[PDB]
Design a protein. Structure first.
Length: 228
């Protein structure tokens, strides 16, 4: 969760594996839970009028560094001391402890930003039929998934972000006695950890955040919404 939303305070969307060559008006689709690049915006419109809206380039943003952290832990103990018409256990013990922790540390320096006017995008679109020929847009025409258009995007030539996730569970169960002479006892312990660090220090500019204006075709009724 923090690994994809650490750039939510400043209104932006985190780009996993930040790369180079993601300009504005690069419409992208969000369906089946995932977000996928879908080429340039002009492919969506059957008749793209002349030139796409102009893109202002190389605007500074003073860089951003910070971290986010969360952790949830809880242990529950259940004890049975009688029969209570539920089988027959002299002492029944259950101990379930689960604790997870996530952390993200990001730092992008020498940050530039390039954007496009959403009103200019609307003027470029205005009255324009959506291309339903390509099957990729066919799903969105029927409302299978949402559609978004990248308007602003920031980049940096020097940055690093490291995320850590951990989760540990332990279930101990003790059921002696029972009507048959059996002493039951079993403990299950599970632990998972994951660390992912992606950095860059070269001279090339790699985008790592963007703003998405949601576009909606919905059987051709093209509308522009603010996506939260």
């Amino acid at each position: 969760d923090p690994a994809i939303t650490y750039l939510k305070r400043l209104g932006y969307n985190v780009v996993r594996l930040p790369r180079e060559g993601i300009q504005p008006l690069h419409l992208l689709g969000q369906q089946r839970g995932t977000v996928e690049y879908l080429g340039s915006l002009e492919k969506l419109i059957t008749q793209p009028p002349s030139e796409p809206p102009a893109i202002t380039r190389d605007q500074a943003a003073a860089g951003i560094n910070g971290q986010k952290t969360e952790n949830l832990s809880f242990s529950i103990g259940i004890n049975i001391l009688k029969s209570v018409l539920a089988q027959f256990g002299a002492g029944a013990g259950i101990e379930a402890q689960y604790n997870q922790a996530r952390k993200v540390r990001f730092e992008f320096s020498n940050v530039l930003a390039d954007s496009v006017e959403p009103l200019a995008v609307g003027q470029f679109l205005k009255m324009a039929e959506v291309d339903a020929d390509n099957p990729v847009l066919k799903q969105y025409v029927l409302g299978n998934g949402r559609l978004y258009v990248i308007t602003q995007v920031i980049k940096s030539n020097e940055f690093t972000v490291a995320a850590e996730k951990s989760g540990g569970g332990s279930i101990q169960l003790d059921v002696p006695e029972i009507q048959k002479v059996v002493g039951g006892k079993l403990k299950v312990e599970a632990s998972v950890s994951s660390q992912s660090t992606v950095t860059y220090k070269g001279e090339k500019q790699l985008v790592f955040g963007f703003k998405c204006f949601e576009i909606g075709v919905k059987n051709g009724e093209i509308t522009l919404f603010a996506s939260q």
